């Protein structure tokens with residue numbers, strides 16, 4: 001029952017072995033979800049489930065630098081379902097963010113923004129009820 005959009009500070013930025021866990025439930029008739037790992041105004045890693053992009057469900061990932069989006073990375077494996085509870089786990093690895101949903105590996109996103117310790121907030125937004133958002137070291 002957290003407020004959405006939700007800002008989760010990541011003190012000191014991210015680092016390999018940091019695991020971020022998001023628990024929520026997708027709203028009925030959802031259109032989109034977004035996770036935005038931010039370096040100031042830049043978005044180091046945008047993870048964007050789209051429930052209806054031309055009648056397809058797709059996850060779009062990208063980076064925003066100086067207000068410009070970069071090259072999209074797309075994943076048609078789509079583990080979210082309207083109305084249903086989910087778990088997103090984002091593990092920071094040396095070279096990439098590694099994302100699993102409901103305990104199944106989904107995608108990796110190579111670090112474009114390389115100052116990991118400056119990626120010090122995570123925004124969580126979209127068509128969800130947000131239950132919890134937290135981090136730990138593994």
Ligand SMILES: CNc1c(F)c(F)c(-c2cn([C@H]3[C@@H](O)[C@@H](CO)O[C@@H](Sc4ccc(C)cc4)[C@@H]3O)nn2)c(F)c1F
Nearest residue numbers: 032033034046048060061062069070071072125126127
């Ligand atoms: C309900 N909450 C919510 C919200 F309020 C939002 F504003 C966004 C959102 C989505 N985007 C963008 C982002 O997805 C990007 C990923 O490549 O694509 C662009 S299109 C585009 C334009 C130019 C180029 C060069 C490439 C692609 C999108 O505009 N920015 N904000 C969101 F995802 C949300 F879920």
